[PDB]
């Protein structure tokens, strides 16, 4: 019901190319039962360096477009911030957005980022009074099968996010993400996940799987847990409330 990680702004990153694509992506998200989407387009040194004024501009146009989808679809502003050290000054001085202007910022790393680097970056952001929500923790080799490390990040004041796509069963044929599904399944079993979110980009390779994932978590982990990960926690994040 509340999706805190999405790529829905046209012509700013690897998401929609056009207004028409953004609308179609919103529509599919709405169809699946999502009622609030936080826009978190990429901020990444050397990869996604679209200027902030453009991202904000196209964002506001997507927010308008969302009215054509449904009147109760709320679009919030945010950023998926790949960590490089310049990001610290940007956050301190609010030149890079948090999630709906809350304390929470969405932070990502590389698949092969060493734990010590992860731990260090997140420690420094915490020192800014900003709470990291760690994007797609199933991506990071450093956390694979590592309850102790994830726990250590959570215990110092981080929250964790897993992509809906990796919540799904590994497919009998054509499975290209088996290792990330196994990782997400590990974290869920260990009860190490605060949030499941879309990371949606398009309707081909990367659609939302929020309805499918919600049902799967309901079946395997109970409805209350599904509510927690897909509604209650995301809602606290959007409303700048402590979890």
Chain residues that interact with Fe ion, rule: CB under 5 A = 80, 108, 135, 199
β partners of residue 80: 42, 106
Output the smallest distance, CB 26 to Fe ion, in A.
16
Output the smallest distance, CB 3 to Fe ion, in A.
11
Output the smallest distance, CB 82 to Fe ion, in A.
7
Query: Do 191 and 233 meet the contact criterion of CB atoms below 8 Å apart?
Result: no
What is d(CA 149, CA 147) in angstroms, rounded to the nearest whole number?
6
Query: Do 8 and 25 meet the contact criterion of CB atoms below 8 Å apart?
Result: yes
What is d(CA 30, CA 35) in angstroms, rounded to the nearest whole number?
6
28 vs 199, beta carbon nearer Fe ion: 199
CA 231 vs CA 71, 85, 95, 237, 239: distances in Å:
19, 32, 28, 10, 12
Q: What is the DSSP letter of 171?
A: P
Output the smallest distance, CB 171 to Fe ion, in A.
22
3 vs 108, beta carbon nearer Fe ion: 108
199 vs 228, beta carbon nearer Fe ion: 199
∠ CA 30-35-40 to the nearest 5 degrees? 90
106 vs 226, beta carbon nearer Fe ion: 106
179 vs 221, beta carbon nearer Fe ion: 179
Output the smallest distance, CB 126 to Fe ion, in A.
20
For residue 64, with 0-12 CB atoms within 10 Å meaning exposed, 13-18 middle and 19 or more buried, which class applies?
exposed
Output the smallest distance, CB 71 to Fe ion, in A.
27
Task: List alpha helices for the chain, DSSP H.
Answer: 19-31, 52-69, 86-92, 115-127, 147-155, 178-189, 210-221, 223-227, 233-238
113 vs 227, beta carbon nearer Fe ion: 113
28 vs 80, beta carbon nearer Fe ion: 80
Output the smallest distance, CB 225 to Fe ion, in A.
23
**Does the CA dihedral 38-216-228-196 come out positive or negative?**
negative
């Amino acid at each position: 019901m509340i999706d805190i990680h999405s790529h829905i702004v046209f012509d700013v990153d690897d998401g929609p190319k056009s207004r028409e694509e953004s609308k179609a992506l919103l529509a599919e998200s709405y169809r699946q039962g999502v009622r609030t989407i936080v826009s978190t387009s990429h901020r990444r040194k050397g990869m996604f360096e679209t200027p902030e004024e453009k991202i904000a501009e196209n964002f506001l146009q997507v927010r308008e477009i969302a009215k054509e989808v449904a009147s109760d679809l709320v679009i919030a502003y945010g950023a998926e911030i790949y960590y490089t050290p310049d990001v610290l000054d940007k956050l301190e001085k609010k030149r890079i957005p948090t999630l709906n202007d809350s304390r929470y910022a969405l932070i990502e790393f590389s698949m092969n980022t060493p734990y010590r680097d992860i731990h260090s970056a997140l420690s420094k952001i915490l020192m800014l009074g900003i709470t990291p929500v760690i994007a797609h923790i199933e991506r990071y080799d450093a956390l694979e099968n590592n309850e102790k490390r994830v726990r250590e990040l959570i215990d110092m004041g981080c929250y964790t996010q897993v992509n809906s796509s990796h919540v799904l069963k590994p497919k009998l044929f054509g499975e290209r993400y088996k290792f990330m599904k196994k990782r997400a399944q590990y974290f869920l079993e260990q009860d190490l996940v605060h949030v499941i979110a879309s990371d949606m980009h398009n309707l081909d390779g990367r659609p939302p799987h929020m309805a499918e994932a919600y049902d799967l978590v309901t079946q395997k982990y109970g409805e209350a847990k599904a509510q927690e990960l897909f509604i209650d926690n995301p809602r606290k994040i959007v409303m700048d409330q402590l979890i």
